[PDB]
C-alpha cells in the first residue's frame, strides 16, 4: 500500500531539486533504491540528495568501482552502485551491517536488483530518459512515510502549475 | 630488511616477504591456492589470509620478519581491517614496527622499478576504473592530484560505452580491439573540459553523448562508432598530460592504470613523445602490479627512511595522494 | 597461565592473566576498534611485562554481533598467535555475555539487527550455560513469541555487558578440556547472513 | 568532563573518564592492595595525559566490606585530592555492586562475613535504586529468613561484582546533585563494629 | 627542599614539613591538636588513634599553612608497625606523590629513630654504637661513617620494657612498670637477691628476659616477708648488669669509642649512672635523650626522608608495609 | 568460672613435651578456627605458641611476646596470626582490626590474654589455660565446645607417645 508521485519531463537541475526535497525530509535509517538504466541519471540525483547533507555535489561520483561511497554530513548517506557487485556477501555481511544505522540514509544505484534483500518500507525512485536534457521520474512512497508525500506533491502542482 | 607485506585492499587476499625490497622470498595469494591445490573463496580476507600467515610462517621463521606492511587506503573499510588490523598485530607479537601503505603512492611508486636509473621529476597519469588522475612527483617524491575526474573513470565510460554497444567484457581490450576496423574521426563526440584552465576531466558527458546517438540513431557501423569515441577519450586524456607535463615543465611521463593498455593511446601518446622529444613509461606485460610484493615494496622503502605508523591507524577507504 | 581472551562482540572487552593475576580492561568511547584495540593489548602486555609468545592460550569473541568490531578483534588476534601458532580459544559472545550476569535459570539474550529482527538466543543456566533456544535471527514479533514461551527470569537487551574474566575463565576451559583452534580455523557467527532470507519470504506473502 | 572513580570493598575496581573516553580496569589476585592500587592508578592517568589537579570529581567506595582493602583505597583517594580539595564522592559498594548486575528485580547483597553472620542487603533495581533492607549484618538462618522473605531474582553472594563503568556514573550523578563531599568528611561503612554488639548480646 | 613526612605506626598519627633537614614549618599531631579542643567549642574533630579519620584533618591544617606546590619529597613510615595503622599513612602518601607530580620515599622507623640522635647532636661523628631498648624493641646497632646500620644484637624473647613493665605488675605496682620499678628501687637494696643474669658471658650480644620475668615469679611464689624495693632493685640491677656488659663489651670488641641510647628504658636512673661509671673509667663517649618521651612524631620521617631524598634512595609505588620489620 | 564445653587437661609436661603437643593442635586443623591462651605472666602462653609454629613449617626464633605489636603475624602452611592483648585499651581494635581478620577462613588465630575480652570471641573458639607445677614442668586444659569435635580424639592419642618415654 504505497503512493506512486510521477514526475514528467524534468530539467537536469529540478531532478537533482526533487533528490534534495525527498532527503530533507527523511529522519531516520532509510533505504533509496534508485531505479534506472545505463545513463537514466541516478548518480545525478544522488548529488541532488547530498545538497540536503551540507556537503558539496562535487564529491559525489559513480560509486561504480568504489561499490560504496559515504557521504558524512547533517546526516551520513552511504552511496551504493550493484553495476560491479560479484559476492553477493557484501549484501548479506556488510550492507546488514549498514543497515543497523538508523541515524543514516542507504540509496542504491541498481537496488532494483537482488529484490528479496531491501525491505518493504524502502523507497523506490524509477528514473527514465525521455528526452536529450529532461529524465521522467516515479517516487513510491511506502505508506508507512506519508510524511514525505504532502513535501513532495506540493512539488509536482509547483511545476505543472 | 624482510618486509612481510599484506593485500586485503584488492581482490586477491595476498601475503608477502622481501628482503631489501628486491629479492622475493616467499609469495602466496589465495588465487594460487586454487589450480595448485587442484575451500578458500574469492576475496574473503578474514578466511583465506589466517591460511597465508599460516603457508608463511611454516617457510620463514617468524624472527627473520623486520617490518610488517600492510594497505590502509584506499579500498573497502572491511577489507582494509582485516589486512590491517592483522598486520598491527604481528608488529605487537613480533616487537617489530609496521607500516601503512597508501596504496596508490605505492602503485605511483613500481614506475621506479620498471626502471631503476628513472629520475623522480616525473607526472604520472593514474587511467584505472577506480581512478582517472594527473600528479606531480617532485625530486623528493612529494606527490599531489593535479587533476582529477568529477564524475567517471576512463575506465567506467569503457566499460559501459562497450555494454552500449552490444561488445564483450572486459570494457577497453573489446573498444580498442574493434576501433582498428573503424573510423575515429568519423562522429564528433564531445571532449569535455578541454581547453580549459581546470587539469580535471568529465566523461559522463560522453557515456551519454554515445546513448543518445545510439537510441536517435541506426544505419551505423558499431567499430566507427567505438573508434570515434575512443579517439575523444584519446584526445582529452593525451591533451592534459602534455599540457601540464608542459605548463609545468617535464619531459618524462608515466601512464599507469588499465586504461594505460590501449593501443590507440599508446599510438597517439608515442607521436607527441616522438616530436616534443619526451620519455614515456608503461607498467609490466601481466599487469598484476596489485600482489603483496606491491605493499612489500612500498613498506620497505617507507621503513628505509623510518616513516612508520602508530597502532591507532585507521583505515581510510577514501585514501588518496 | 598466561591467557589472552579478548570479545570486541559490541564494546571492547579485553581479560589477562599472568600466572596468579587477572586483569580486566574495557574502553567504552568514541575511537573505533582499530584506533584502541591494539594499542591496549600493547600496552597491557608491556606491562605485566610479558610478550605474546609467553601466552599459554588467546581467546576470542567471534560470536554474534557487531560486524566491523568482530572483523577487527579476529583479525588482530590472528596477527598476534600466528607466528607462533598460538592455541585460540573460540568464544561465543551471547553464550559469553550470559556467564558475564550473575544469576540462575533462564536467561534471552538478544541485539537488536536490521530495521526489524533482533539476533536472539535463550539459556537455561544453573551452572554450566545449557542452550533452549541456539541463536538465530527473529523478527520483532517472533521475539515476543520466544519470551512468553521459554519464559525468561532475565533479559539482556541490546546495551550487553561481557565480563572480560569470564572471557579468560572459558578460554582456559577449552585449552583444559581440549577445545581450542588454529587461528586458520576460526569462523565468525555471521547472523547478518540468515536477515535476508526472512525479508524475501515476508514480502512473498502477500 | 573528568572522573576518577575506585572501589577497594572486595577487589581493586577503578574507572577513569576523560570526557569523550572511559576505561575500567579491574585487578583480582595475590598482590595486597597497597601494592597493586596506587600503581595502576598512576599508570593510567599516565596514559590520557591527565594531572589530578584536572578531576572535576574523584568517587570512592566506602561501602561495607573488608577493612585493609577499603582503609588503603580511601587513604590512597585521600592523598590524590588532599592538595586541591578535588570534590569526593562516597560511593556504597553494595548499591555500586547491585547497580553493576544487569537484571532488574529484588536483588540481595550478602557477604559472608565473621564465620557465622554475613554483611547484608536487599535492593529494588527499577527506575533508580530503591533501597528496601539497609546495609547491616546477620545471622546465618536470619540470612533465610531475608531470603524466605523478600524471595529474589538475584543472589549477589561472596563474589560481588562491581563494574568501574558504574561508579563513574555514580559519581557524575553525585557531583550534580551537589551530593559531594570533602576529603576530611569521608565515613566509612565498617559493619564489622556491629558484629561484636551483636554477640556479646549472645553469649 | 620541603619535605612532607606522616607518621602511623602504631598509637600516634602525625604530619610534618621540613626545610633542607632540622627546619621545621609544621609538625601536626592529634596530641597537641587535642588540649587545643577545649578553645571555641567542637566540629571537625580528631578521635586519638584513629589514623583514617584523623590523617585527613592533620594534612588539611597542613596545606592551609603550606601550599602544597613548595612540597618536593613525600615519606611516610612503611614499618614497623600495626599493618592497618600503617597503611593509611603509606597509602596516603604515595597519593600525595601521584597528584603533585613529586617522587615518594618509604622510610625505616628504626633507621628513624636512630637518626633522631643526630637530631640532638649534629656535631656528632657517625662511627658509632647505639643500645635501642624501648618496650617495642632492645637491639644493639653499628652506623657506618656511611651512616648504614646492621643489627648486631636482638632479644630472644622479650624487652627489658616487657620485664620491667610485668615484673611491675608481678609485685602489683603502677604501670609503666619501668618507672614505678626505678622510683621504688631507689629506697631498695640492688643486692639484696642474686636473680640470673640470663646470657652473660655468652659468646654473643643477643638477649635474654624471659628467664628473668619467671625467677621472680618463682620468687614470690616461693617467698614470704621480703621488701618489695630489695627486689625491684635487685631485679632492676639484674637488668642494668645484662645491659651495660652487652653494650660495652660491643662498643670495645668493635672498636669504637662513642655511645648512644634510645628507649624509655634509656630513661633508668639506675642504668644511667653505671653506664655513665663505666665510660667516665673507659674514658668512651655516651649519649642519652633528654627527659621528654616523644619519641613517636613526624620530625623523625620528614628527615629520614630529606635524608634518603638527599641520596636519591627513593620508593617505587608497588611499596607494602612490613610490620616485622628491623634494620 | 564455669564453661561445660570438654575438659581435656594434662600435667607435669617439660618445656619440650609442652611445644610437641602445640605442634599437634594446630597440625591438626585446616583453616577458620581461634585459639586462647590463659594462665597468669611467665606461665608459657609465648612458649606454647612456639609450638604452633613447627606446624607451618617455621622454626620457633621469630615466636616473641607480640605484647606491645599487639599481632605478630607469622606466614607459613597456614599464616598463623599471634596476639597478646594484655596491654589493650581501644577496643576498637577487636570491633575493627581483629574482626577484618575473621573473615579470613583458611588461616589460624591464637591469642595470648584472650580470656581478658572473654565473649567477643566466637563460641566455636578453642581455650589452652597454662597452669604451672616445677619451675620446668606445667599443667595444661586444652577446651573444645561441640562446635568441635576429632580433635578430643587426636588430642588423647598422642598423650601415650611421649607421655610414657
Ligand atoms: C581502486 C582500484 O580498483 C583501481 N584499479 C582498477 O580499477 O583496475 P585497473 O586494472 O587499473 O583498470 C581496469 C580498467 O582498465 C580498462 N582497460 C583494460 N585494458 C584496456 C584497453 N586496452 N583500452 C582501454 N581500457 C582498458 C578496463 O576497461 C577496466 O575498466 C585503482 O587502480 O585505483
Ligand atoms: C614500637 C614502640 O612501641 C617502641 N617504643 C615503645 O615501646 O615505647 P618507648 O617510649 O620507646 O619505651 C617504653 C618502655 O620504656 C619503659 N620505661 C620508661 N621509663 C623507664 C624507666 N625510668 N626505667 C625502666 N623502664 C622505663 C617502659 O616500662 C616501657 O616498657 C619503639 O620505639 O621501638
Ligand atoms: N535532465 C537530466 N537529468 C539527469 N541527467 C541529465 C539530464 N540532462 C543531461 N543529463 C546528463 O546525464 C549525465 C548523468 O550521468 P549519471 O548520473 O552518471 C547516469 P547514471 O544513472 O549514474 O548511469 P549509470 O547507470 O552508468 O550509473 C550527465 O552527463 C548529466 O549532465
Ligand atoms: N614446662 C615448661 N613449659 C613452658 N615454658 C616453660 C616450662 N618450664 C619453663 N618454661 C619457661 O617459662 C618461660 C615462659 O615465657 P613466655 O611463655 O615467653 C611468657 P608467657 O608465659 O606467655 O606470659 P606473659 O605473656 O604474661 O609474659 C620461658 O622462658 C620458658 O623457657
Ligand atoms: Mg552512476
Ligand atoms: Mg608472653
Ligand atoms: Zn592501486
Ligand atoms: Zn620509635
Redesign the pocket.
Known amino acids: 500500500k504505497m503512493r506512486h508521485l510521477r514526475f514528467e519531463n524534468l530539467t537536469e537541475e529540478q531532478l537533482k531539486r526533487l533528490a534534495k526535497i525527498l532527503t530533507e525530509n527523511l529522519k531516520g535509517g532509510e533505504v533509496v533504491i534508485l531505479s534506472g538504466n545505463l545513463g537514466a541519471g541516478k548518480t545525478t540525483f544522488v548529488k541532488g540528495m547530498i545538497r540536503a547533507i551540507g556537503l558539496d555535489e562535487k564529491m559525489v561520483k559513480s560509486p561504480t ?2 561499490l560504496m561511497n559515504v557521504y558524512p554530513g547533517l546526516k551520513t548517506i552511504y552511496h551504493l552502485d550493484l553495476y560491479r557487485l560479484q559476492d553477493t556477501d557484501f549484501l548479506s555481511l556488510d550492507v546488514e551491517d549498514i543497515l543497523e544505522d538508523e541515524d543514516g540514509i542507504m540509496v542504491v544505484e541498481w537496488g532494483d536488483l537482488f529484490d528479496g534483500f531491501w525491505p518493504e518500507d524502502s523507497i523506490k525512485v524509477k528514473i527514465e530518459i525521455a528526452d536529450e536534457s529532461h529524465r521522467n521520474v516515479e517516487i513510491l512512497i511506502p505508506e508507512e512515510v506519508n510524511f514525505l508525500v504532502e513535501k513532495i506533491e506540493r512539488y509536482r502542482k509547483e511545476l505543472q502549475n | 630488511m624482510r618486509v612481510l607485506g599484506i593485500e586485503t ?2 581482490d586477491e587476499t595476498a601475503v608477502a616477504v622481501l628482503d631489501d625490497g628486491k629479492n622475493v622470498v616467499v609469495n602466496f595469494t589465495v588465487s594460487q591456492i586454487e589450480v595448485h591445490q587442484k575451500e578458500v573463496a574469492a576475496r574473503h580476507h578474514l578466511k583465506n589470509l589466517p591460511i597465508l600467515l599460516k603457508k608463511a610462517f611454516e617457510k620463514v621463521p617468524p624472527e627473520t620478519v623486520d617490518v610488517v606492511a600492510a594497505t590502509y587506503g ?2 573497502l573499510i572491511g577489507a582494509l581491517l582485516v589486512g590491517l588490523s592483522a598486520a598491527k598485530g604481528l608488529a605487537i607479537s613480533l616487537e617489530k614496527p609496521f607500516v601503512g601503505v597508501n ?2 603512492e605505492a ?1 605511483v611508486q613500481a614506475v621506479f622499478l620498471a626502471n631503476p636509473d628513472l629520475k623522480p621529476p616525473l607526472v604520472v597519469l ?6 582517472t588522475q594527473l600528479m606531480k612527483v617532485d625530486e623528493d617524491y612529494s606527490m599531489e592530484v593535479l587533476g582529477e575526474t568529477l564524475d567517471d ?4 565510460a ?2 559501459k560505452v ?1 555494454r552500449l554497444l552490444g561488445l564483450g ?5 573489446v ?3 574493434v576501433a582498428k576496423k573503424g573510423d575515429p574521426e568519423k562522429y564528433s563526440f564531445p571532449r569535455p573540459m578541454l581547453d580549459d584552465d581546470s587539469y580535471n576531466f568529465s566523461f559522463a558527458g560522453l557515456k551519454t553523448s554515445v546513448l543518445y546517438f545510439l537510441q536517435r540513431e541506426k544505419g551505423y557501423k558499431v567499430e566507427d562508432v567505438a573508434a570515434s569515441f ?1 579517439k575523444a ?1 584519446v584526445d582529452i586524456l593525451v591533451e592534459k598530460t602534455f599540457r601540464l607535463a608542459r605548463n609545468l615543465g617535464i619531459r618524462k611521463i608515466a601512464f ?10 599508446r599510438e597517439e601518446v608515442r607521436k607527441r613523445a616522438e616530436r616534443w622529444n619526451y620519455e614515456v613509461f608503461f607498467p609490466p606485460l601481466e ?1 598484476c ?2 600482489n603483496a610484493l606491491m605493499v612489500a615494496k612500498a613498506g620497505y622503502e617507507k621503513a628505509k627512511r623510518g616513516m612508520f605508523s602508530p597502532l591507532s591507524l585507521n583505515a581510510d577507504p577514501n585514501l588518496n595522494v | 597461565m598466561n591467557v589472552l581472551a579478548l570479545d570486541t562482540s559490541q564494546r571492547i572487552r579485553i581479560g589477562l592473566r599472568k600466572g596468579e593475576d587477572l586483569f580486566e580492561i574495557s574502553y567504552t568511547g568514541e575511537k573505533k576498534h582499530a584506533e584502541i584495540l591494539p594499542v591496549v593489548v600493547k600496552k597491557l602486555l608491556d606491562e605485566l611485562d610479558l610478550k605474546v609468545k609467553d601466552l599459554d592460550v588467546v581467546g576470542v569473541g567471534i560470536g554474534p554481533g557487531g560486524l566491523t568490531g568482530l572483523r577487527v578483534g579476529i583479525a588482530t588476534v590472528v596477527g598476534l598467535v600466528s607466528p607462533y601458532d598460538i592455541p585460540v580459544a573460540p568464544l561465543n559472545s551471547f553464550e559469553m555475555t550470559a556467564k558475564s550476569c550473575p544469576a540462575d535459570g533462564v536467561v534471552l539474550v538478544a541485539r537488536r539487527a536490521r530495521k526489524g529482527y533482533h539476533y536472539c538466543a535463550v539459556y537455561l543456566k544453573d551452572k554450566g550455560l545449557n542452550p533452549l533456544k541456539e541463536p538465530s535471527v527473529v523478527s520483532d514479533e517472533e521475539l515476543e513469541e520466544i519470551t512468553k514461551e521459554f519464559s525468561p527470569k532475565i533479559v539482556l537487551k541490546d546495551d550487553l555487558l561481557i565480563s572480560p574474566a569470564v572471557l579468560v575463565e572459558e578460554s582456559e576451559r577449552l585449552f583444559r578440556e581440549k577445545k581450542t583452534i588454529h587461528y586458520y580455523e576460526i569462523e565468525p557467527l555471521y547472523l547478518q547472513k540468515s536477515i535476508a532470507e526472512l525479508n524475501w519470504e515476508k514480502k512473498k506473502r502477500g
Do not use: K, W
Not at chain 2, 153 to 156: D, H, I, K, L, T
Open positions: 568501482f568504489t | 585492499s584488492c584506499p579500498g596504496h596508490v602503485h593514474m587511467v584505472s576504473g577506480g581512478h573513470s576512463a575506465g567506467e569503457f566499460d562497450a567484457y572486459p570494457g577497453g581490450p573498444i580498442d580491439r575512443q577519450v599507469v592504470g588499465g586504461v594505460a593498455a590501449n593501443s590507440m593511446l599487469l602490479t596489485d
